[PDB]
């Protein structure tokens, strides 16, 4: 019978080789996720369809930010085959009230607080 899958915890234990490959820092884990759905929920069990709705991933290729906490990660582990998970990067820190309207999320996962639409002078 096809039932829900229990993923062993050994799968989610990063080796030192993995850290070098992906550049993550285990001592400074990223605060937020960037979850994007890249696979259809059709031809998948209903519990995967429901979790996608809970995460706000109804529309594919639409980035969504979620907190890097065990409860949120538990939902991600169920539909990890339908999504792309990337860490959110803040080169200039969190957006402030002054630059709320000048933010953009680049394809590299970086949220830039200034977006001038001009070439760099350097």
């Amino acid at each position: 019978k096809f039932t829900r899958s229990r993923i062993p915890e050994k799968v989610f234990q990063a080796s030192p080789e993995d850290h070098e490959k992906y550049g993550g820092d285990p001592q400074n884990p990223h605060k937020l996720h960037i979850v994007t759905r890249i696979k259809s929920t059709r031809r998948r069990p209903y519990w995967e369809k429901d979790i996608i709705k809970m995460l706000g991933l109804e529309k594919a290729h639409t980035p969504q930010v979620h907190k890097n906490i065990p409860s949120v990660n538990a939902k991600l582990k169920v539909v990890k085959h339908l999504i792309r998970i990337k860490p959110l990067k803040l080169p200039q820190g969190l957006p402030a009230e002054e630059n709320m309207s000048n933010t953009c999320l680049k394809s590299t996962g970086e949220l830039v607080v200034q977006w001038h639409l001009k070439p760099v002078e350097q």
């Binding site: 989610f12 992906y22 993550g24 990890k80 792309r84 998970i85």
Partner: protein, 43 residues
């Protein structure tokens, strides 16, 4: 002269289906994406 008994893709006797070169690459490409998802759920 070569016909599949019954329907092609169902039944005891089926029309064989073969994995092309790009079919493997597409699966490997999605496998790499999910492998990186395992890393970001570990921290």
């Amino acid at each position: 002269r070569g016909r599949i008994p019954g329907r092609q893709w169902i039944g005891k006797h089926r029309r064989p289906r073969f994995v092309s070169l790009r079919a493997k690459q597409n699966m490997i490409r999605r496998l790499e994406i999910e492998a990186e998802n395992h890393y970001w759920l570990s921290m």
